[PDB]
Coordinates of C-alpha atoms in Angstrom, one line a residue:
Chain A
X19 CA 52.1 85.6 -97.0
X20 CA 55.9 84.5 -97.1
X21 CA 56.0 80.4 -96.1
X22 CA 58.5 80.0 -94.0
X23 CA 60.5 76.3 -94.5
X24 CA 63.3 74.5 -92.2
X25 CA 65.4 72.1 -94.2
X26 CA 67.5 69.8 -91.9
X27 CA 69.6 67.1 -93.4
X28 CA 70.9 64.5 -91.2
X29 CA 74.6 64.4 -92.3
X30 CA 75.3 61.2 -90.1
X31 CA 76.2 59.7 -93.9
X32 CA 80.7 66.5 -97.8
X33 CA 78.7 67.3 -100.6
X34 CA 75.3 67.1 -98.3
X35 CA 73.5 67.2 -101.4
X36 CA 71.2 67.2 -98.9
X37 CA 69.7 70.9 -98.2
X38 CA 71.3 72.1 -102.5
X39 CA 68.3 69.3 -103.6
X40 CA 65.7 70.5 -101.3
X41 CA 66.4 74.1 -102.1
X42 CA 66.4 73.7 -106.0
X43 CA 63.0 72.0 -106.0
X44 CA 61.4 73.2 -103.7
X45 CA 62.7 76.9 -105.7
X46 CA 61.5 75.2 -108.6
X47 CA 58.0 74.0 -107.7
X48 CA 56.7 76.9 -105.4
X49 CA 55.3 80.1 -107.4
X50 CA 54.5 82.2 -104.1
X51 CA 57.2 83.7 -101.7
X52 CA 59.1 81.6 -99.3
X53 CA 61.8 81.6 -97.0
X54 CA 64.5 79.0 -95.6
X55 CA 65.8 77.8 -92.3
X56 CA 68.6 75.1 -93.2
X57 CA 70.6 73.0 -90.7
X58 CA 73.3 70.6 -91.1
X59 CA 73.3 67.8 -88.0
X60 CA 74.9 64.2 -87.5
X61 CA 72.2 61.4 -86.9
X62 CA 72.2 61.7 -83.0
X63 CA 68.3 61.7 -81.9
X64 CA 69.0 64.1 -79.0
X65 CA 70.1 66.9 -81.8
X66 CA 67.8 66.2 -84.0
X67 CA 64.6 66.9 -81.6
X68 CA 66.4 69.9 -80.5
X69 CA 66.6 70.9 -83.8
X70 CA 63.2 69.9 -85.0
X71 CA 62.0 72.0 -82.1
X72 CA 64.0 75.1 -82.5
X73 CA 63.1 75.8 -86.0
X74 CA 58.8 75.5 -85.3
X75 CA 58.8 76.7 -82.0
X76 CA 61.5 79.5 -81.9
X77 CA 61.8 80.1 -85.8
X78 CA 58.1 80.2 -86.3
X79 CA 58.5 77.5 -89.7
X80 CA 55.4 76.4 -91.0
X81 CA 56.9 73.5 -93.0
X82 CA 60.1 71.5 -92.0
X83 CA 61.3 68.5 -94.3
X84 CA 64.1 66.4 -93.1
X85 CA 66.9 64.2 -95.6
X86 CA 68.3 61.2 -94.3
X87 CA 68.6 58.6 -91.4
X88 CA 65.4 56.9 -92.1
X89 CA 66.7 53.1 -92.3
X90 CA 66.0 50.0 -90.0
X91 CA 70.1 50.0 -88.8
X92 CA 70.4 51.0 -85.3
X93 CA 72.3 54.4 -86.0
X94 CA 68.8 55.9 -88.4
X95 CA 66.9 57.7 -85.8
X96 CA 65.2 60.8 -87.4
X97 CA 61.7 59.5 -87.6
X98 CA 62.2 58.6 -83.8
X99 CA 63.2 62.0 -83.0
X100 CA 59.8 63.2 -85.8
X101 CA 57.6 61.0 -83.7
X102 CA 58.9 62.0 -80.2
X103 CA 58.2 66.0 -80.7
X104 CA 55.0 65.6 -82.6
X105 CA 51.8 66.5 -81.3
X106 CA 49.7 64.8 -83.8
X107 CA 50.7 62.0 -86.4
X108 CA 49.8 61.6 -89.6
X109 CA 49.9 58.0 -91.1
X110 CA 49.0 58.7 -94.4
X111 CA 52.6 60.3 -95.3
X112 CA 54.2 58.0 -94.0
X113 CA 52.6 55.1 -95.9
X114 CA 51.8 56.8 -99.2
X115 CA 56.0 58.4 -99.4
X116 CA 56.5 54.2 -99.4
X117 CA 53.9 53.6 -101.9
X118 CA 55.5 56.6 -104.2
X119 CA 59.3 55.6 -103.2
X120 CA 58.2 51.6 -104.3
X121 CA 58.7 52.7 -108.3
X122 CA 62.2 54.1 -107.8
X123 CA 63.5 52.3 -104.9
X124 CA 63.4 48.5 -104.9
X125 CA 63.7 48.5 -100.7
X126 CA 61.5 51.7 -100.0
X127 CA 59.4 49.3 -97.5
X128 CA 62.4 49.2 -95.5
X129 CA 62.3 53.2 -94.8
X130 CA 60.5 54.4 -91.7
X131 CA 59.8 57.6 -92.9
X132 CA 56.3 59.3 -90.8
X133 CA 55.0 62.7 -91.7
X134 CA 53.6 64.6 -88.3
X135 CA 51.9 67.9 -86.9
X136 CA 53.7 70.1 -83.9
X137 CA 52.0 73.0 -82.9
X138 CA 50.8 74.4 -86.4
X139 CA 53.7 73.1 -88.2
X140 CA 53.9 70.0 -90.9
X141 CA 57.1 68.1 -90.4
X142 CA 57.9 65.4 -93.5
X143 CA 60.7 62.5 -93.3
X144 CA 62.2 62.5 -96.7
X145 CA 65.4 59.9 -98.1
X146 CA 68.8 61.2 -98.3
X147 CA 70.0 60.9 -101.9
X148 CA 68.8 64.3 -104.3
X149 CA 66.9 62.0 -107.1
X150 CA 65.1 60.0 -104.4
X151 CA 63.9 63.5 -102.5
X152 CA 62.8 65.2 -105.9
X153 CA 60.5 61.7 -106.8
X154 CA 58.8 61.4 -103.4
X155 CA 57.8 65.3 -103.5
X156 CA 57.0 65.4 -107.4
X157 CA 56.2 61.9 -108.1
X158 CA 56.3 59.7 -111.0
X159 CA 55.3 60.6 -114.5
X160 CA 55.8 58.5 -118.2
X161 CA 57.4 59.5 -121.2
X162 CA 54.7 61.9 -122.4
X163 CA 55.2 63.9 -119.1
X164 CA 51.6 62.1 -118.0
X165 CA 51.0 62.0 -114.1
X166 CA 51.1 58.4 -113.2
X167 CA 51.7 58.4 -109.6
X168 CA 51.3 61.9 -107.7
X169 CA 53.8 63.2 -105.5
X170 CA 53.7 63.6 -101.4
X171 CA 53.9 67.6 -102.2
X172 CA 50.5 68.0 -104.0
X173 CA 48.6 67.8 -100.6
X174 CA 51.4 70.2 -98.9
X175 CA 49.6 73.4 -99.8
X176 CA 46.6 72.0 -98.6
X177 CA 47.4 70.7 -95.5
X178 CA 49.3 74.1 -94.7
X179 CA 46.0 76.0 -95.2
X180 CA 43.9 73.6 -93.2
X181 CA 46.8 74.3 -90.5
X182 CA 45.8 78.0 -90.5
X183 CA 48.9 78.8 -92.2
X184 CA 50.0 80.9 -95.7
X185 CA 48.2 80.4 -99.2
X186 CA 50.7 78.1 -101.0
X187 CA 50.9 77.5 -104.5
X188 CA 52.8 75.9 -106.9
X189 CA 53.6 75.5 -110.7
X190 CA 51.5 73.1 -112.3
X191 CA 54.4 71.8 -114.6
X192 CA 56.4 70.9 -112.0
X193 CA 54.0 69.4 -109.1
X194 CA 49.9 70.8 -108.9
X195 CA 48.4 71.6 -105.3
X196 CA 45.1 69.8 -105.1
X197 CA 42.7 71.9 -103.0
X198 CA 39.0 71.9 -103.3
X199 CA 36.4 74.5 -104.3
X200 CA 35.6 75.2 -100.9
X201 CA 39.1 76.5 -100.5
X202 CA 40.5 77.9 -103.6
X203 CA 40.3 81.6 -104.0
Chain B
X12 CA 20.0 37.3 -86.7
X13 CA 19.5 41.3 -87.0
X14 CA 22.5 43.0 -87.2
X15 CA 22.5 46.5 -85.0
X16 CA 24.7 49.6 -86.5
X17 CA 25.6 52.7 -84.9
X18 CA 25.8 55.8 -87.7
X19 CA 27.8 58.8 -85.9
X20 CA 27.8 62.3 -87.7
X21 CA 30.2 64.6 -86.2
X22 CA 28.7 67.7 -87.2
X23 CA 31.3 69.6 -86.7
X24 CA 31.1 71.2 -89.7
X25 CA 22.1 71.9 -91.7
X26 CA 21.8 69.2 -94.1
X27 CA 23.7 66.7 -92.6
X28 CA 23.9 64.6 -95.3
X29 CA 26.3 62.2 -93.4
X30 CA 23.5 60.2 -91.5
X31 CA 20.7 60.0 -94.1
X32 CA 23.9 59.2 -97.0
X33 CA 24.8 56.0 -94.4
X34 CA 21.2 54.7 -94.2
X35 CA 20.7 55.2 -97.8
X36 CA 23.5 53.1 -99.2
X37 CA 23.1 50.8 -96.4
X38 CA 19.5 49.6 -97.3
X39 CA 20.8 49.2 -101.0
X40 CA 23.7 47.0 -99.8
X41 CA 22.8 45.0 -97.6
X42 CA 20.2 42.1 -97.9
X43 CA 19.9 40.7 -94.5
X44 CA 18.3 42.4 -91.5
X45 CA 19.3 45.4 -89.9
X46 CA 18.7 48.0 -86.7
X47 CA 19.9 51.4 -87.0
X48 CA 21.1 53.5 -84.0
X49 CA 21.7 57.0 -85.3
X50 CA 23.6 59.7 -83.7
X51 CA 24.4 63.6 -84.5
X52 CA 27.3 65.3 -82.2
X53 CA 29.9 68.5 -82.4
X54 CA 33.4 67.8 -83.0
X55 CA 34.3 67.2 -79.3
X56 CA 36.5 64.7 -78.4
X57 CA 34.8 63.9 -75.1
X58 CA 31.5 63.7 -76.5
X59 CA 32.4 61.9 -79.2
X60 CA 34.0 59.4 -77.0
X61 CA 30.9 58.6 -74.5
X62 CA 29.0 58.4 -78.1
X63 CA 30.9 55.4 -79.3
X64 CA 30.7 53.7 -75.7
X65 CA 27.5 54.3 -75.3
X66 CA 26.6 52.9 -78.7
X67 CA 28.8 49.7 -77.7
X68 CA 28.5 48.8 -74.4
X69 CA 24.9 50.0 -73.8
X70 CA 23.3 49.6 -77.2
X71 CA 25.2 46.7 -78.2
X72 CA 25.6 47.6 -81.8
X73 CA 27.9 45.3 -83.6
X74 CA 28.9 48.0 -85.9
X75 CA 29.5 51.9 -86.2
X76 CA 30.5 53.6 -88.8
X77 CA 31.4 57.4 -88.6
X78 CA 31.3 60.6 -90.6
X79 CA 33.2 63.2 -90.3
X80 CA 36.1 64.9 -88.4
X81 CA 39.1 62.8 -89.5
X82 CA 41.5 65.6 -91.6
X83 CA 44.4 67.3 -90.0
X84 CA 42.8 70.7 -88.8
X85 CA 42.8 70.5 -84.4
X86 CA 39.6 70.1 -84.2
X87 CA 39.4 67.1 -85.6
X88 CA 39.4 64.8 -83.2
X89 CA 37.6 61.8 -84.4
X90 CA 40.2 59.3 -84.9
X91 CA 41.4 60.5 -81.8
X92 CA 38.2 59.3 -79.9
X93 CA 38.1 56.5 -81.8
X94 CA 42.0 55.1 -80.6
X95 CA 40.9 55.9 -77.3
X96 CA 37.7 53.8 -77.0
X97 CA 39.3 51.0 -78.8
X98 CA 40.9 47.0 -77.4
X99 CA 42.4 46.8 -80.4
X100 CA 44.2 48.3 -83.4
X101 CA 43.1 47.0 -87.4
X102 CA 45.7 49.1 -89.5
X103 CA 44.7 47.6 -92.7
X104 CA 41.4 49.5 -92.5
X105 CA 42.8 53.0 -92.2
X106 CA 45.6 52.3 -94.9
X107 CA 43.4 50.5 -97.2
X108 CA 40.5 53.4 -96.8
X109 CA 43.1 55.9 -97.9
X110 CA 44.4 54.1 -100.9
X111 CA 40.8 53.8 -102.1
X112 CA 39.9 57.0 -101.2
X113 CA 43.2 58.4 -103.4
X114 CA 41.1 57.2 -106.7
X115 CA 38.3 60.2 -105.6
X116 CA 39.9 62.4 -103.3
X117 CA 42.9 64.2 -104.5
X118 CA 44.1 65.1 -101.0
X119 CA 43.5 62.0 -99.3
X120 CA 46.6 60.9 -97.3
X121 CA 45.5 64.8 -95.0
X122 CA 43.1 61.6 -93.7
X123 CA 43.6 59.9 -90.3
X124 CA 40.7 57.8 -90.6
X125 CA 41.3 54.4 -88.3
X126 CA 39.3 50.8 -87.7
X127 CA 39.7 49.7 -84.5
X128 CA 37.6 47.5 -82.0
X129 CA 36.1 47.9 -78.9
X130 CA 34.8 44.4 -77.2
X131 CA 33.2 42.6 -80.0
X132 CA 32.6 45.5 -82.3
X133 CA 33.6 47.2 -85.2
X134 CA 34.2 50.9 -85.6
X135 CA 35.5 52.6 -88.9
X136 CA 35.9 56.1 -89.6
X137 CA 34.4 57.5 -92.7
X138 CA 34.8 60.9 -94.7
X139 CA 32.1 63.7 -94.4
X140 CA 30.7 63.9 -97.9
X141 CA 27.8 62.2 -99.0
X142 CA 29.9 60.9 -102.0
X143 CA 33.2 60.0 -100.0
X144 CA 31.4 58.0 -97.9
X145 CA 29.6 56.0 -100.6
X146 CA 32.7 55.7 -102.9
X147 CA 34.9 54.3 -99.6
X148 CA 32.2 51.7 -98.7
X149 CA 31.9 50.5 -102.4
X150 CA 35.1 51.0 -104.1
X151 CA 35.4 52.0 -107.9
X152 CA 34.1 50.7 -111.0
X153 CA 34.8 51.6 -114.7
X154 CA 31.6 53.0 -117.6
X155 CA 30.9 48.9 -117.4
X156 CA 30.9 48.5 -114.5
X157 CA 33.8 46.0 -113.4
X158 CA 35.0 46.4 -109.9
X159 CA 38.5 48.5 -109.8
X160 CA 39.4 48.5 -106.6
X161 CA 37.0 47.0 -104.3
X162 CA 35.3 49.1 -101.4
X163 CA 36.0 48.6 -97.9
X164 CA 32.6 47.0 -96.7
X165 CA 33.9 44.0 -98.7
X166 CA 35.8 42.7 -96.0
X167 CA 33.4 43.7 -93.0
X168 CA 30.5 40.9 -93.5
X169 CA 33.3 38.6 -93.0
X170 CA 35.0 40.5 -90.0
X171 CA 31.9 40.5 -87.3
X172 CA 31.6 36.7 -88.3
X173 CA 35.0 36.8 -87.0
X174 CA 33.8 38.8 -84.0
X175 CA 31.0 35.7 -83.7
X176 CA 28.2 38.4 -84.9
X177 CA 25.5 37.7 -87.1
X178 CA 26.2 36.2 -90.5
X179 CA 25.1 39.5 -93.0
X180 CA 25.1 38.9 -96.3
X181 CA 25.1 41.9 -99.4
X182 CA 23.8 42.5 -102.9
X183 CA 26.4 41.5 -105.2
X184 CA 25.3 44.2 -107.6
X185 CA 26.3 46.7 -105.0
X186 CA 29.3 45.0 -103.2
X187 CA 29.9 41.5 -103.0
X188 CA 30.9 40.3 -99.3
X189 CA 34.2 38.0 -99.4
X190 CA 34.1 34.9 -97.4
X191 CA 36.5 31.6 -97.7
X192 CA 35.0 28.4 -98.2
X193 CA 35.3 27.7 -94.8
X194 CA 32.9 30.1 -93.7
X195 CA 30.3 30.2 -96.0
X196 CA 26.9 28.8 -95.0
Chain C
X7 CA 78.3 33.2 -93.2
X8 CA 75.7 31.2 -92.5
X9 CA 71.9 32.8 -91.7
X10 CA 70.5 31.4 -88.9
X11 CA 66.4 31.3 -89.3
X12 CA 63.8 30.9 -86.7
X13 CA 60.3 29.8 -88.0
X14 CA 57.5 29.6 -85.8
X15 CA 53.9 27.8 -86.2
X16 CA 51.1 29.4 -84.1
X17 CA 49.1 26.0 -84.3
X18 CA 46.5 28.0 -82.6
X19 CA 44.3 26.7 -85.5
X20 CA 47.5 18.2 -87.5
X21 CA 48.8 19.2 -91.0
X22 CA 50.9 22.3 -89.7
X23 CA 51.7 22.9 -93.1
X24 CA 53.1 25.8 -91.6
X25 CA 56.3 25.0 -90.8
X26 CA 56.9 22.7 -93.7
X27 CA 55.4 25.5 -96.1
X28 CA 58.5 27.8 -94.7
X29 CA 61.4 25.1 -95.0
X30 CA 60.1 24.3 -98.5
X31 CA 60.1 27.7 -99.7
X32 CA 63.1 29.1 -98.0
X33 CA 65.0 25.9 -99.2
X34 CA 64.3 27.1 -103.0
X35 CA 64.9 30.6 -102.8
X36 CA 67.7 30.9 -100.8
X37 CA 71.7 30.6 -102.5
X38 CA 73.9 30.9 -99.7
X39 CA 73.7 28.6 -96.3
X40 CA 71.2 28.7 -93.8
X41 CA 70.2 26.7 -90.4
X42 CA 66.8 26.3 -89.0
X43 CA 65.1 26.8 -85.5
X44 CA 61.7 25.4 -85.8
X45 CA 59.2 25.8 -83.3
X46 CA 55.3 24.8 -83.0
X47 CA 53.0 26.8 -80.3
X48 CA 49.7 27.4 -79.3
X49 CA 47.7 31.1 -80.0
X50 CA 48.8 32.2 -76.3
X51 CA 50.3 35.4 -75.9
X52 CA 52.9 35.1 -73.5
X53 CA 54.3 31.3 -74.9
X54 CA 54.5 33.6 -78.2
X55 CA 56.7 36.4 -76.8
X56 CA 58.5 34.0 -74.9
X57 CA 59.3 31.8 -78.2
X58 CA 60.1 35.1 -80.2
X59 CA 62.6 35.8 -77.1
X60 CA 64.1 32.4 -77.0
X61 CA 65.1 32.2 -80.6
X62 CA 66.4 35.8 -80.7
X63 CA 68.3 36.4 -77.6
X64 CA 69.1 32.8 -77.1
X65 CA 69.7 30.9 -80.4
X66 CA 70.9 34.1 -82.0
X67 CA 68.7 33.7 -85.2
X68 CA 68.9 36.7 -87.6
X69 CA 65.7 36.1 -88.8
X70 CA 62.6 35.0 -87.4
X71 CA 59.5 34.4 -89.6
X72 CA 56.0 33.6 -87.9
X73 CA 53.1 32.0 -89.5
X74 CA 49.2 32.6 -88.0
X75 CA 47.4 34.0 -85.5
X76 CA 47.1 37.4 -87.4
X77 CA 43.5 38.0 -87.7
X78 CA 40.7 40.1 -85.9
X79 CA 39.6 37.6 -83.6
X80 CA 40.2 37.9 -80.0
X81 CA 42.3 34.7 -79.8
X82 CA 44.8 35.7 -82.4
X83 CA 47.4 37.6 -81.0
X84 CA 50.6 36.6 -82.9
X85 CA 51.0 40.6 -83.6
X86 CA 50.3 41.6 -80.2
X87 CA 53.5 38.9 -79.3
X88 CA 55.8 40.5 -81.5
X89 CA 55.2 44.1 -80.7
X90 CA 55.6 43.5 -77.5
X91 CA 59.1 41.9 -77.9
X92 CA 60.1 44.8 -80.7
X93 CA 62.7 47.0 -80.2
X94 CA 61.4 49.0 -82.7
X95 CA 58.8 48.8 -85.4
X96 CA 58.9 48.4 -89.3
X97 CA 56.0 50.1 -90.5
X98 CA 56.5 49.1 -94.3
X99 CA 56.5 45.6 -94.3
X100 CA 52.9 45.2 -92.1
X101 CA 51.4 47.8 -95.0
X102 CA 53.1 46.3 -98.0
X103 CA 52.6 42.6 -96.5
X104 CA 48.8 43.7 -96.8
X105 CA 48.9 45.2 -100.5
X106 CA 50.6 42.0 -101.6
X107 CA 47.9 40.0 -100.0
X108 CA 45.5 41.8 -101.4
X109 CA 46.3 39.8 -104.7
X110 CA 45.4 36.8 -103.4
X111 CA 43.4 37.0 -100.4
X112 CA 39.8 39.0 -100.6
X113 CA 39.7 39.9 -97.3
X114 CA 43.6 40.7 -96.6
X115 CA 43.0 43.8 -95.0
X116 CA 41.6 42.4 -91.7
X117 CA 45.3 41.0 -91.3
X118 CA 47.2 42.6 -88.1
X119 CA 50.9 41.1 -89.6
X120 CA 53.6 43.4 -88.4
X121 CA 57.4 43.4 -89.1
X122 CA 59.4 44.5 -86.5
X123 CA 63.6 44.7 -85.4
X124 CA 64.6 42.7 -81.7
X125 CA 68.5 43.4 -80.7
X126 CA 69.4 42.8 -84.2
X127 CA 66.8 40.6 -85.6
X128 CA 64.4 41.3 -88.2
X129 CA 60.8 39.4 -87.4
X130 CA 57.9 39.1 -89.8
X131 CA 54.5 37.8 -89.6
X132 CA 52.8 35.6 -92.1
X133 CA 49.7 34.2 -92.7
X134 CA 49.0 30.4 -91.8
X135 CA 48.2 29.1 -95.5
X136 CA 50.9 27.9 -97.6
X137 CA 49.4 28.9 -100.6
X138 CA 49.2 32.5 -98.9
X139 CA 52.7 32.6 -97.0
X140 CA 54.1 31.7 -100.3
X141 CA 53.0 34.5 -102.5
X142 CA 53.6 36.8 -100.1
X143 CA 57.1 36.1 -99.4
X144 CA 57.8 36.0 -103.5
X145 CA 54.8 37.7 -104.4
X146 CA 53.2 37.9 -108.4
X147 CA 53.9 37.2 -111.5
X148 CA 51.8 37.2 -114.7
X149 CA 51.5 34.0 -117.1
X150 CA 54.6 34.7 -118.8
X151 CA 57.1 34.6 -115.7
X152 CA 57.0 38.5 -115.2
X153 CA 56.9 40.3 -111.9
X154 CA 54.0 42.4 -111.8
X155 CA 54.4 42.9 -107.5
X156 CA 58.0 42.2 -105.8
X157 CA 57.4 39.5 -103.0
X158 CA 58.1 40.6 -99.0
X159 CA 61.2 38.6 -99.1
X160 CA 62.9 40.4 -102.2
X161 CA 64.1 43.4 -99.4
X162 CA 65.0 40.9 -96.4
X163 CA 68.4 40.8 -97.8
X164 CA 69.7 44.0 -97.6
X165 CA 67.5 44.3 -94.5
X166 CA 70.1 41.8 -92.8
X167 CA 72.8 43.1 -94.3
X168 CA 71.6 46.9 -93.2
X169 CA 71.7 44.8 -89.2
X170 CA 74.9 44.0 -89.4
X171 CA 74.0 39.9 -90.1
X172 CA 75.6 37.7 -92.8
X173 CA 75.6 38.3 -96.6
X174 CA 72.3 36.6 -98.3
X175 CA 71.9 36.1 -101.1
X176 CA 68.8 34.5 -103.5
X177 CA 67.8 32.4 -106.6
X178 CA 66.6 35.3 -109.3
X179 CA 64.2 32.1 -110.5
X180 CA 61.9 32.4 -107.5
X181 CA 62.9 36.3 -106.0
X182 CA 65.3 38.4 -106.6
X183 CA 67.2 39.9 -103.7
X184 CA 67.3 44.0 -104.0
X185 CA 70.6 45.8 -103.5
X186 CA 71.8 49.3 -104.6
X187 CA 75.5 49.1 -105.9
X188 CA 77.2 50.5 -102.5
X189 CA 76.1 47.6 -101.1
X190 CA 76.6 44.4 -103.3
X191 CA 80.0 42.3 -103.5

């Protein structure tokens, strides 16, 4: 089946390079069909909830990934409004997007990035500059073109399927979807 | 003194291999005495609640470990039951049981495995399979057999000390069980 | 401007080499002026919140670094203190505060340490031995001088700056202070 994916960047930071970077990876690393849902919002919690919750419950998304306002100042609020329409967290996105973010991003300790369920839906915090996006979803590689250190994506298809949602796949050069052989086909 | 252990399948999923796969590795790790308290439930939040206060307060176990349950599908609730029973939160024992777990589980952030605990006891929440469980206790070793990344039952001789248990001690060959100065005997 | 810095000794445990461990490191690393707040407390729950409180709201420290009372047992409740005085919470440094330590301390992950944000303080919590509180605030190097894992205190910097609090800045000899180009002078 067609995945259907909301991109919202929060423009509170133009050239919102934003949703473009989301769109050409994510066009990139996906082999199977797909369809997007993009919003543009300022970093106001209210509006981003609102927004969070329009695209799973009224658009039907299966997938939503967020750019910007994940910092420790005052005004950086998305994973408040992530955390405040979930219905289940998921801890391990959270931590392992700072363990992937430590090798290009000196301060990625100081993001507060969380990856959570609503309804049937994955919703995943991601930084707001285009190189920093494409790393944490593709991860880090050497010279050679050698995985090193995998990205948050390869366990996206997965976690879609476990969620009852479409078979995702992706292109191994870019980023491979690990899935075991009790749920390959 | 004897130390008592609660072992928790949560057959949700027959062979369950996640009770006999605790008491197997275990009796090869550990070197001081030991009660076992075994237990084989569905995924049901409820029951699986009453299960781990029943093995607390009533059976006075000073451990439980846990199989099963913990991805992102809904009806996973272990974790879930396992926040709710608990006094108190030990987040290096999730994080730390998914970075150990990403050396043999490709997917291993979908995990929401937590250590909490509940008067004087420790719970931990483990993976289903036989060999997940085994590699998360123990940790990884290379074709020599030089400790990698050290297993997660490392730490928890020295934590019911902490929680004024009884003083268990492990075969090195196995795991070894850390300890300051100040606490060895 | 100059950075005004709380420390805090949860003598709960004399020698408090905890507070001295603090001024001597602090003294070395930092470049640019600073004042000190020091404060020496029992492992009591409310005289910590209340201290936390005291030196944020009232003595207008930026920064507010704790040492002790982090562990599993029942009377250490430094953690408990300071997310109950959070205005909001800092996931990164507690989980990266923990992989440092697990460098030098076997058993790190039974710590508890959190890093939250009061009004616009940053807080941290470290552990009670120097040695310890040390390496985690400048973390390791190899034999040769080289960095092999960036030290907690190597994002604090920017952190402050990110709050709106005075420009910091730090001897490259003992930690280097992180800072992408939009933000350095």
């Amino acid at each position: 089946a067609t995945l259907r994916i909301g991109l919202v960047s929060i423009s509170d930071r133009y050239q919102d390079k934003g949703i473009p970077a989301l769109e050409e990876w994510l066009t990139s690393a996906l082999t199977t069909p797909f369809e997007l849902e993009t919003r543009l919002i300022p970093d106001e919690q209210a509006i981003i909830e609102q927004t969070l919750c329009e695209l799973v419950d009224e658009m039907s998304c299966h997938l939503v990934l967020t750019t910007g306002g994940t910092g420790p100042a005052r005004r950086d609020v998305t994973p408040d409004a992530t955390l405040a329409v979930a219905d289940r967290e998921m801890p391990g996105f959270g931590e392992q997007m700072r363990q992937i973010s430590l090798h290009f991003v000196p301060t990625a300790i100081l993001s507060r990035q969380v990856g959570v369920i609503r309804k049937q839906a994955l919703i995943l915090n991601l930084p707001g500059q285009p190189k920093s996006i494409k790393e944490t979803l593709e991860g880090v590689k050497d010279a050679e073109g050698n995985v090193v250190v995998h990205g948050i994506f390869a366990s996206v298809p997965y976690c879609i399927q476990l969620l009852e949602g479409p078979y995702v796949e992706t292109a191994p050069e870019v980023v491979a979807a690990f899935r075991p052989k009790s749920a390959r086909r």
